[PDB]
């Protein structure tokens, strides 16, 4: 008895039917095969459980054995779970560059990743070059960007310019990108976005031994602790190279530093589900970190 499933990438909707004992890995492989993605190590499948919680699909476990929200077809989102240390030397395929571009641009536009107004304009500039191609005074007449969402709401609200005025600045940059290929435009966007403080960071609310509210940041290079009201600059950093090991006991999270002097660091997460999520991102990120070196 086949099981109907739907998988959506940033710009595509895929329809599959799997058997009862299909594993996440088998579903995953069918997805990347369909869109011709070979740079698969960054991606994963997101689903919603019966309790309405977003979760990443375990690839080693059967799809049917993971409490995916009951429905026909089952619904999954194909998304990048991990980010490259540098897009330039890691994303070679157009499909991959496109998926990261679209996912990152969505997060920037939704104010997910903080972005200075000036940078938002430059970023929008590459997105327009990617979408419209070379600026052509004959076809791209004033107002040609009126129907495009190009800047995050936060930017629009801090600077009271009219849409026309924003478009004017965006257009001036657009004109300067003539000759830039669609794929190259997307990569330029990413090269800029990847230098943003909040780019590629998974934040989790935690508390330290003093009960102070903080954020745990997990990214490609290790872990960071942020003060509750500042997610841009780490309060303290824990690069992989300074980490002996990492473990969690239910809600307790401990970071044993390689160093002799430096003592251990304990942090508390609200739910065990959170700690499991953190450990998983820590494992995956570190793994990719080491592949960039030895494997």
């Amino acid at each position: 008895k086949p099981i109907n499933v739907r998988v959506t990438t940033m710009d595509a909707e895929l329809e599959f039917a799997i058997q009862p004992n299909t594993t996440g890995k088998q579903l995953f492989d069918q997805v990347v095969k369909t869109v011709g993605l070979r740079e698969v190590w960054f991606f994963g499948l997101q689903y919603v459980d019966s309790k309405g919680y977003s979760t990443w699909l375990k690839l080693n476990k059967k799809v049917t054995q993971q409490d995916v929200k009951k429905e026909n077809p089952l619904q999954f989102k194909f998304r990048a779970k991990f980010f490259p240390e540098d897009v330039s030397e890691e994303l070679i395929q157009e499909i991959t560059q496109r998926l990261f571009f679209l996912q990152v641009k969505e997060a920037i536009l939704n104010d997910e990743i903080y972005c200075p107004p000036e940078t938002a304009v430059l970023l929008a500039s590459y997105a327009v070059q990617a979408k419209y191609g070379d600026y052509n005074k004959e076809i791209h007449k004033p107002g040609y960007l009126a129907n495009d969402r190009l800047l995050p709401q936060r930017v629009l609200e801090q600077h009271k310019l009219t849409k026309e005025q924003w478009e004017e600045r965006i257009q001036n940059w657009h004109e300067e990108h003539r000759g830039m290929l669609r794929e190259d435009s997307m990569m330029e966007y990413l090269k800029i976005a990847q230098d943003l403080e909040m780019y590629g960071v998974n934040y989790f609310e935690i508390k330290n031994k003093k009960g102070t509210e903080l954020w745990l940041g997990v990214d490609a290079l290790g872990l960071n602790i942020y003060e509750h009201d500042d997610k841009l600059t780490p309060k303290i950093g824990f690069p992989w190279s300074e980490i002996r090991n990492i473990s969690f006991n239910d809600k307790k999270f401990v970071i044993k530093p390689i160093d002799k002097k430096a003592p251990d660091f304990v942090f508390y997460a609200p739910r065990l589900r959170i700690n499991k999520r953190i450990l998983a991102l820590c494992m995956g990120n570190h793994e990719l970190y080491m592949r960039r070196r030895k494997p």
Binding site: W240, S241, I243, R244, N245, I246, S247, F248, N249, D250, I258, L272, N275, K276, L279, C282, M283, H286
Partner: peptide
Amino acid sequence: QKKKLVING
């Protein structure tokens, strides 16, 4: 639950 993850050493 209890889970450990070796990073270095």
